[PDB]
Amino acid sequence: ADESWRAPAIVQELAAAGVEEPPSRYLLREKDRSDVKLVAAELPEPLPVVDLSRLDGAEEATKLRVALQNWGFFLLTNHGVEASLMDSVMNLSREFFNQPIERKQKFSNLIDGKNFQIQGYGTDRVVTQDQILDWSDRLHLRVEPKEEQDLAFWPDHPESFRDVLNKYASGTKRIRDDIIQAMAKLLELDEDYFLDRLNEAPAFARFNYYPPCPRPDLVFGIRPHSDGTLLTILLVDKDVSGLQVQRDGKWSNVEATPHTLLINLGDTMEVMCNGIFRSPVHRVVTNAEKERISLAMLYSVNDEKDIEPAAGLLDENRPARYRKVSVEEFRAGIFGKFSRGERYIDSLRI
Ligand SMILES: O=C(O)CCC(=O)C(=O)O
Ligand SMILES: [Mn+2]
């Protein structure tokens, strides 16, 4: 029939219309229903914190190693990005999502109202009619390489959105480079081993918007997933919690102070470092009272080399833990398995 299921609703509009319950395509399926944690732990463990300005020192590099091996992510302080620039990119995000739907839909990622592409305002690809939908919208923009930006999908109001996002992305790219240099040293690989695969590499800004949900126990704001990136640099809502990370089968809340950044490895890095460091599975749970926003800067490698464990980590006593795949096949796997709520990297394990 008419594949209207391929063009899902804007979730912010569902919430504004006043749905009393999540429509059926957003409902989790038992397995995920039993694992939705809405209550905080009351005695959470301290989270790993890394001070970028101290990262040349052995003691700080050790804190990074502990974070990368045991958590897959860390809070980052003293990272050099002006606090007011962080405020501006988030507030201009709020200003965009607060615009009338008529205006926002000019940036829809459903071309002609039906044809899906990644870039734009909407949600991720709907592959099957029985696919579960997340309780969020997102504005997904290619920021890098700068010459490949399509400004027809960048909001023109607020007027400064483009300038502020580009300035913000310049800072997070510098952070990306500093972190990957420290990771190369931890792995005893050439300090520029990852820089070669980042030449003219794609990078994206994912502005997530999680509307309030009348039944936060029945949906996910964004489904459990690991990022497919090399590195993700995440700026979370400073007022509204919801991010959670999986560690040893348990979910725990991730709470960050304003202007602290969250850095996590993606599946590309887990493969390239042969699983010495882990790409963490995370999710966002909704709440019934307030919307939540986040901005994920998603840093991928270029398509010049196949994705595989670094040769310097492999020898006669140290086998590869993941098989080699082209970037095109890796991309299709990350995107396709996300739609099914499955973990693509598991299919690569040897
Ligand atoms: O909203 C968040 O805190 C997480 C976003 C996220 O996981 C992603 O955009 O990949
Ligand atoms: Mn993510």
Q: Is 99 helix (H, G, I), strand (E, B) or coil?
A: coil
CATH code at position 224: 2.60.120.330
Is 282 touching ligand 1 by the criterion CB < 6 Å? yes
What is the domain extent for residue 121?
4-348
Question: Is 35 labelled a binding residue?
Answer: no
- Which one-letter amino acid corresponds to residue 234? L
Q: Which atom of ligand 1 is nearest to the CA of 292?
A: 1
For residue 138, the ligand 1 atom closest to its alpha carbon is 9
The verdict on whether residue 210 carries a ligand-binding annotation is: yes
Total of domains in the chain? 1
The token duo for 154 is 């960048």
Whole-angstrom Cα distance, residue 113 to residue 322?
39
Give the distance between the most distant pair of CA atoms in the chain: 62
Which residues 6+ apart lie within 8 Å of 232 measured at CB? 263, 264, 265, 266, 296, 297, 298, 299
| Protein residue closest via CA to atom 1 of ligand 1 | 294
- Spatial CA neighbour of 267 closest among 243, 312, 298: 298
Distance CA 190, CA 57 (A): 18
Q: How many helices (H) and strands (E) does the chain have?
A: 9, 14
Method: X-ray
* Alpha carbons within 13 A on the beta-carbon side of 243: 24
CB atoms within 10 A of CB 59: 8
Measured CA to CA, the distance from residue 158 to residue 96 in angstroms comes to 7
- β-pairing, 49-51 vs 73-77, is parallel
Answer whether 227 contacts ligand 1 (Cβ < 6 A): yes
Phi and psi at residue 73, in whole multiples of 5°? -150, 170
Q: Which ligand is nearest to the CA of 210?
A: 1
Resolution of this entry, Å: 1.8
Kindly report the protein residue whose alpha carbon is nearest to atom 8 of ligand 1.
296
User: Measured from the CA of 225, which atom of ligand 1 is nearest?
Assistant: 7
Please name the amino acid found at residue 187. L
Cα distances from 185 to residues 61, 174, 251, in angstroms, run: 9, 17, 31
What is the amino acid identity at position 298? L
The structure tokens listed for 8 are 């899902």
- Give the whole-angstrom CA distance, residue 163 versus residue 214: 36
User: Measured from the CB, is residue 124 less than 6 Å from ligand 1?
Assistant: no
Q: Are the CB atoms for 299 and 231 separated by under 8 Å?
A: yes
Sheet holding 203-210, edge to edge: 49-51, 73-77, 261-265, 231-236, 292-299, 203-210, 137-144, 120-122
Q: Which of 134, 255, 260, 282 to mutate to test the pocket of ligand 1 (most atoms within 8 A of CB)?
A: 282
The closest-lying atom of ligand 1 relative to the alpha carbon of residue 227 is: 10
Any residues with CB less than 8 A from the CB of 26 and at least 6 apart, and which? 132, 133, 134, 135, 218, 219
